[PDB]
Design a protein around this ligand. Structure first.
Ligand SMILES: CCN(Cc1cc(=O)n2nc(C)sc2n1)c1ccccc1
Ligand SMILES: N[C@@H](CCC(=O)O)C(=O)O
Ligand SMILES: N[C@@H](CCC(=O)O)C(=O)O
Ligand SMILES: C[As](C)(=O)[O-]
Ligand SMILES: [Zn+2]
Ligand SMILES: [Zn+2]
Ligand SMILES: [Zn+2]
Ligand SMILES: [Zn+2]
Lengths: 259, 259
């Protein structure tokens, strides 16, 4: 019986450093939605675990011409972690190389603007040029636009992939800072979950506008054919049905919202 | 190469008899979201199929005494069908005996009222007796209330399980008709998908009120360990990422709206 290595990512409010983390040890250094969820999954499946932050700070993408997976997906694919408990989006290209539980949280790509920005939709972004816009790198949102055959989204991708300087950012935090610092001249495309969270945080100067561009979910991921997969899947469904996932969302998004 | 037997259920707008069904044969008798979905799934997985309407007209529940499954779930469990393509809710007790694809559509339990009924929430229903309320039999909504430790819902189940005359119905259509003819003295608990569909159909006298009580999804189901399960799962994700599922939702819900 071995300690399960959990890969996750510093992404608020999923996993964050506790204020006093320096004086704490192991799993106690972290807090957030996925820290709470990991404890519950492990309890219900009966395993001990170690939270580890993914080394390259990425979600997971396959390099073209190198074909190596980076991020949390890479940690699973190459045997460095036993399970990923993170806001990791269920996508076809990932499900081909790793296993996902049923989803524990729903989301869709969405638009973040600085308040007052003259934008209400993706169509709006696509039909103008004054306001720049981009996505996270090495994630499922970038891939959505890269692959889309829908005219509005193809138009946005054609713009974003060629825009200079780059409209892509390394972390969600970078995208949010760029929105806040650009006086309305930058909009950020990110998952509704993260958008909704930031909307509840000081300085309360951003907001989600328009509907979501797609509809999908986060899943708990394991290496393909892992024996952990079945129990983890059943645990997600149990925690869903018992209302835990709704409680955790309220706790980390809304209960202590600052706006 | 064998023709795949698909079990499904007559439930609008998922599977409906075409107006001219009496002169049509086989799969062409039927239309709707799940008829379209079946055709897409079959094309991407490369099989031929026959749509069959579930014999007992039920989704699926286990008899507490005999432990025998009925409905579509039973047809899969006992080898009568190869796959279920229907608004079949992903649940823990079901996933223990059959396999589900990743979800193709989201839903939550919701309240249907006759327009003008003084009800805004589940909490409202629980705190009164003038307006009776019930659910579908042999489905996931009934099981939700039976197994709910949440205060308001637990209170609701105690009322419903002992209600006389019975507040439970055999079909969604029976529930809706009961709302429409009870002059506001019956409210129906049903999935948001079906609620939102009915609200857009003549005679436009019903309404979805309040938020959803939970958050979950429908999946394509296969018997445990079936060879079809893998391909079906990937096909759902492909259709999701293509925007096809969104297209079908708009086609059958809102393009066909008449209120
Ligand atoms: C997260 C709660 N859901 C809803 C949900 C999640 C999700 O990824 N997608 N993708 C779609 C395409 S429709 C949808 N609905 C859920 C949870 C467990 C089992 C099924 C659903
Ligand atoms: N959740 C995304 C990362 C965030 C984004 O791409 O917007 C993923 O799994 O790649
Ligand atoms: N979709 C439900 C049936 C409808 C309901 O229970 O409200 C099921 O799979 O059981
Ligand atoms: C397994 As428990 C009810 O202590 O989270
Ligand atoms: Zn620190
Ligand atoms: Zn628990
Ligand atoms: Zn197709
Ligand atoms: Zn009770």
């Amino acid at each position: 019986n071995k300690t399960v290595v959990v890969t996750t990512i510093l992404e608020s409010p999923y996993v964050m450093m506790k204020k006093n983390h320096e004086m704490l040890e192991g799993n106690e250094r972290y807090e957030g939605y996925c820290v709470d969820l990991a404890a519950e999954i492990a309890k219900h499946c009966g395993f001990k675990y170690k939270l580890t932050i993914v080394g390259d700070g990425k979600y997971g993408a396959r390099d073209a011409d190198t074909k190596i997976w980076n991020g949390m997906v890479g940690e699973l694919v190459y045997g460095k972690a036993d399970i990923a408990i993170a806001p990791l989006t269920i996508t076809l290209v990932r499900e081909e190389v790793i296993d996902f539980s049923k989803p524990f949280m729903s989301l869709g790509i969405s638009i973040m603007i600085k308040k007052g920005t003259p934008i209400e939709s993706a169509e709006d972004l696509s039909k103008q040029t004054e306001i720049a816009y981009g996505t996270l790198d090495s994630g499922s949102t970038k891939e959505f636009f890269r692959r889309s055959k829908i005219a509005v989204f193809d138009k946005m991708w054609t713009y974003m992939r060629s825009a200079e300087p780059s409209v892509f950012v390394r972390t969600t935090a970078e995208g949010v800072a760029r929105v806040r610092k650009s006086k309305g001249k930058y909009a950020y495309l990110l998952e509704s979950t993260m958008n909704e969270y930031i909307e509840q945080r000081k300085p309360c100067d951003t907001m989600k506008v328009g509907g979501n561009l797609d509809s999908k979910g986060y899943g708990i991921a394991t290496p393909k054919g892992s024996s952990l997969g079945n129990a983890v899947n059943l645990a997600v469904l149990k925690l869903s049905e018992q209302g835990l996932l709704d409680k955790l969302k309220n706790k980390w998004w809304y209960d202590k919202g600052e706006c």
